[PDB]
């Protein structure tokens, strides 16, 4: 069955292409490509944030916009900056430098903790490898299984991202208990060296190779929405837009227009976990709510 389109592949659409998906609040659309907007053009109704250069920005949007203009200035901590505060992510007990076990040293706490395997997915995988030096996100076909590793502690951090973030400091972090701690977060960052096909190439725009079944399933396996902006029908439980983009299942009736057409949020008639540097992903949807609203195509007066 022909799930991938041929004419769309010539353009190699990314998350910056307006012709498939909305831009981010810190971006506008110009000639079908999301281009970074100036920091003073962001809405001014938000909270202060801290970057990697220990510089304070009035709102979240301006930090991402300046990061957009000058790359490298990632995110650090919610609120004002801290002198000794630093966010670090490392890989321990790895046979090489491109695999191992996920460890996170938060800006708040000095203690370096591990991640559950239940909360790990492709959304948080590619964002993890990004600030680690792997420009092509994480690998989908290769998984790192332990050498029968003995784990002492039981503390875990439950992680949730969107998929297009630039560092794991942006995503929400919650601490959870795990009896015995059989959960175990692994990661295999993608290893580059260019190749030849066979092997169901399904080439990404960034150049990463994944399996057939991984594309057009609602999952952003490439890291820049390359296997999702070129679909005629979705593989798994992903929903299909009129344009030709596959979105995750929980993106329906979630309070945010995902498709450019907007058919995912029609006919929609449808929590003890705690704190740790507050979720910025929700602030992204809040800023979108403060975008230029006005009437067009309204039935009523």
């Amino acid at each position: 069955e022909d799930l991938v389109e041929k004419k769309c592949l010539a353009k190699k659409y990314t998350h910056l292409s307006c012709d498939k998906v909305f831009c981010q609040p810190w971006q506008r659309c110009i000639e079908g490509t999301c281009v970074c907007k100036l920091p003073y053009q962001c809405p001014k109704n938000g909270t202060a944030v801290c970057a990697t250069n220990r510089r304070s920005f009035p709102t979240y949007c301006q930090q991402k916009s300046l990061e957009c203009l000058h790359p490298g200035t990632k995110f650090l901590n919610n609120g004002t900056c801290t002198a000794e505060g630093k966010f670090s992510v490392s890989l321990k007990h790895g046979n090489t430098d491109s695999e191992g076990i996920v460890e996170v040293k938060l800006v708040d706490q000095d203690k370096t903790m591990f991640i559950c395997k239940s909360s790990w997915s492709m959304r948080e995988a590619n964002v993890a490898c990004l600030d680690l030096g792997f420009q092509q996100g994480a690998d989908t076909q290769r998984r790192f299984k332990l050498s029968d590793l003995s784990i002492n502690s039981t503390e875990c951090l439950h992680v949730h991202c969107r998929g297009l973030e630039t560092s794991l400091a942006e995503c929400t972090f919650t601490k959870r208990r795990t009896m015995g701690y059989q959960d175990f977060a692994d990661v295999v960052c993608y290893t580059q060296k260019a190749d030849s096909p066979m092997d169901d190439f399904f080439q990404c725009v960034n150049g990463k190779y994944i399996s057939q079944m991984k594309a057009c399933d609602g999952i952003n396996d490439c890291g820049d929405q390359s296997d999702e902006l070129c679909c005629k029908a979705c593989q798994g439980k992903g929903f299909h837009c009129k344009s030709g983009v596959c979105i995750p299942s929980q993106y329906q009736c979630n309070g945010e227009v995902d498709c450019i057409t907007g058919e995912d949020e029609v006919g929609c008639a449808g929590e003890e976990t705690e704190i740790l540097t507050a979720d910025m992903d929700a602030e992204r949807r809040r800023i979108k709510s403060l975008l230029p609203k006005l009437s067009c195509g309204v039935k009523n007066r």
């Binding site: 110009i30 281009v35 100036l38 920091p39 003073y40 920005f57 009035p58 301006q62 300046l66 203009l69």
Partner: protein
């Protein structure tokens, strides 16, 4: 405006370049100067967009700033140099295929020292004022 060789502080630059007349504020670099009998053209590449207006930028692309030949002598614009330029929206001229900029009566044109030159002590004052200016305009802007 020739507003230089006077008290050209930081408040002055913020106050002048924030007027409603001023539409765009760009930092440009003079690539080539084609001298002519009719007009003068300064093909400049907009290195950084401090404030954007009608023309939507790519960084790397170039735009030609046209000026009457009588003005060539008042500010000898040399190639491979940088400048802080801001102007009105009324200084636009062309449909879009040949869209040029006019250094008019309200066009601010200040010389921008090179990075090795800012280490020098003669350009020290101007370098500090200009760097701050760009930062304040991008993040904070004009109060409106």
């Amino acid at each position: 405006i020739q507003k230089s060789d006077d008290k050209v502080t930081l408040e002055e630059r913020l106050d002048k370049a924030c007027e409603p007349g001023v539409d765009y504020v760009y930092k440009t670099r003079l690539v080539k100067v084609q001298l002519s009998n009719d007009f003068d053209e300064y093909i400049m590449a907009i290195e950084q967009t401090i404030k954007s207006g009608s023309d939507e930028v790519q960084v790397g692309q170039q735009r030609t700033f046209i000026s009457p030949i009588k003005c060539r002598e008042a500010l000898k614009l040399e190639e491979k140099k940088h400048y802080l330029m801001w102007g009105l929206s009324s200084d636009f001229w062309g449909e879009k295929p040949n869209l040029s900029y006019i250094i008019g009566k309200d066009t601010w044109v200040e010389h921008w020292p090179e990075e090795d030159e800012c280490q020098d002590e003669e350009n020290q004052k101007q370098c500090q004022d200009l760097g701050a200016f760009t930062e304040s305009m991008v993040v904070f802007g004009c109060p409106n």
